[PDB]
Design a protein around this ligand. Structure first.
Ligand SMILES: [Cl-]
Ligand SMILES: [Cl-]
Lengths: 271, 271
C-alpha cells in the first residue's frame, strides 16, 4: 500500500508520513474525506514539489494510517498540536504549509497559534471561514461505506465526472473500510455538522492579523466548500493572492494538477 | 521618445507600434488614461514576454502617437476594427490578446466579432461588464492637465503610493500635454461617463459564448475598475482562471510585474 510511508512519534501519536525531497520544508495537510490519507490527497503534488523542496505529507491523527488513540480528544487545537509535533519530531523549525479544505482550516490555526513556525501558506478550498453547511460536505462527512456512496462523493469532488470511474470508486471504497477507518470517521463530524465548520473556521478578526504571504486556491465549481469562502479569505488576508480555476471542482490539485503545481512551486520560489 | 516605435498603416490609420520578439504573436492593448501609450503601459511586460513570443504593442487610434484622424468616429467597433487592421497589416492571422482596462473591453469585443482571429485572452482589470462609474474612472477620464491632477491619477492607479514620485507625475503630465493629446482625450469620454462603461462592456449573454482559454487578472484594491467586475467575468467565461493580487491597484503589470509576467507567459506556454 503506497499510502503507507514512514512512521514517527509526534505529539505522542505514532504517525504515518511521507518525506520526499531536500531543502526548504513544506508541510502538506490533507482534507477530511472517508478513506483519505496524505498520499491519496497529494500523490500528484509531491513529485513536482519535491524537485525543489523537502515535502512532508503526514496522515493527521484520526485519519489514514496514523494511530487512532483510544478515547482521543479530536479538536482543531489537538490537530494543530499534531502538526507542530510532527514538525518538532523532524526538527523542522519553520516551514511553508499547504492545507486542503479541513487542512486549510488547520493551516490558518497553526499560523495563528505558532506564527514563528509558519512561513508561506497555500490555502486550497480551505474551511477557514464560516459558511452554511453544503450538501456536498454533509454527504462527505455523513458517508457510510458503499461503492455507490463513494461514487457520489467522487462526483461531488469533481467538475469533470469522466474522472470518476468504477475502478476509482471501488478503490476508495476499499480504502474507507480498512480496519478502524469508518469507525473513527463516522464519529469525527457528527450531526449537526455546522458545528464543525464553525469550529474549524477562524474569526475575521484573527484572520486579519495573519502576516504570512498567502496563496488562496479554489475550484469555481467546488461543491464541498463554496467559492465565496475563498473570496472572503481573499479580502481578509493582507498579503494574499487568490486564484480561481474555472471548470474545476474541490480537487484543484487533481483536476488542475500542472497549473496548481506551477503556481505553488513559483509562489514558494519567491521566498 | 521611447514611446515612439514603428509606423504602419492599419485600417486606414497611420499607427505607432512596437514589435519585439519572435514566434507566436501576442497583441497587448493598453488602457485609456491621459498620455497613455502602448510603451508606457507595457514597458515592463514586453521584455519578459518577447523572450518567448512575438509581442505587438500598438497605440490605439485616438491615443499615443498613432494618428488622430479629423472627425474620426471613435467607438468600440472602430477600435476593434483598428486592432484587426493592425493584425491584417502584420499578416498576423491568429494571436493571443492581453487587454488592460479599456483594452480588456476591446479584447472581449474582438474575440466576439472576430473569434477566428483570437486564441487566448488575458483580461487585466478589464472594462468588460457594466459597473457603476467609480470616482477613480471619473477622475481618469475627466482629467485636465496639471502635475497635481496627474499625481492624483497615479495615486488612483497605485496601492503603494511610494511608487508615485514627483518625477513620475511630472513626466506623465508632460506626456499628457503633447500636441493634440488632451484635445482628443477630453472629447473621448465626455460626461455622463456611465455611457462609455456601458458601451465598452459586453452583455452577459455574449460573454458566456466565449470559447477562449482566458486568464482574468485584477488588483484587489483597484480604484478604477472594481474587483467585482472581474469576479463577474470569472463566473461568465467558461474556460477562465481568475487571479487577484492583494496589495495591488489597477497597475497589476506595474505593481506585481514579475508575478504578472510569469502567470501570462506560462498561460500562453500551455498553447
Ligand atoms: Cl475537508
Ligand atoms: Cl481604461
Amino acid at each position: 500500500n503506497l499510502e503507507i510511508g514512514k512512521s514517527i512519534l509526534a505529539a505522542g501519536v505514532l504517525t504515518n508520513y511521507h518525506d520526499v525531497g531536500e531543502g526548504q520544508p513544506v508541510i502538506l495537510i490533507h482534507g477530511s474525506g472517508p478513506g483519505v490519507s496524505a498520499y491519496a490527497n497529494w500523490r500528484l503534488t509531491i513529485p513536482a514539489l519535491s524537485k525543489f523542496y523537502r515535502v512532508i505529507a503526514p496522515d493527521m491523527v484520526g485519519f489514514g494510517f496514523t494511530d487512532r488513540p483510544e478515547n482521543y480528544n479530536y479538536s482543531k487545537d489537538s490537530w494543530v498540536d499534531h502538526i507542530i509535533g510532527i514538525m518538532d519530531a523532524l526538527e523542522i523549525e519553520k516551514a511553508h504549509i499547504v492545507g486542503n479544505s479541513f487542512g486549510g482550516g488547520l493551516a490558518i490555526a497553526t499560523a495563528l497559534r505558532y506564527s514563528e513556525r509558519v512561513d508561506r501558506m497555500v490555502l486550497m478550498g480551505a474551511v477557514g471561514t464560516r459558511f452554511d453547511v453544503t450538501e456536498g460536505l454533509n454527504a462527505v462527512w455523513g458517508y457510510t461505506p458503499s461503492i455507490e456512496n463513494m461514487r457520489n462523493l467522487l462526483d461531488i469532488f469533481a467538475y469533470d465526472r469522466s474522472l470518476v470511474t468504477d475502478e476509482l470508486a471501488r478503490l476508495r471504497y476499499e480504502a474507507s473500510i480498512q480496519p478502524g477507518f469508518q469507525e473513527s470517521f463516522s464519529s469525527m463530524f457528527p450531526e449537526p455538522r455546522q458545528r464543525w465548520i464553525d469550529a474549524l473556521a477562524s474569526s475575521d478578526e484573527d484572520i486579519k492579523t495573519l502576516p504570512n504571504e498567502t496563496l488562496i486556491i479554489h475550484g469555481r465549481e467546488d461543491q464541498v466548500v463554496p467559492l465565496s469562502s475563498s473570496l472572503r479569505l481573499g479580502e481578509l488576508i493582507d498579503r494574499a493572492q487568490l486564484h480561481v480555476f474555472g471548470r474545476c471542482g474541490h480537487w484543484t490539485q487533481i483536476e488542475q494538477t500542472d497549473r496548481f503545481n506551477r503556481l505553488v512551486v513559483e509562489f514558494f520560489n519567491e521566498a
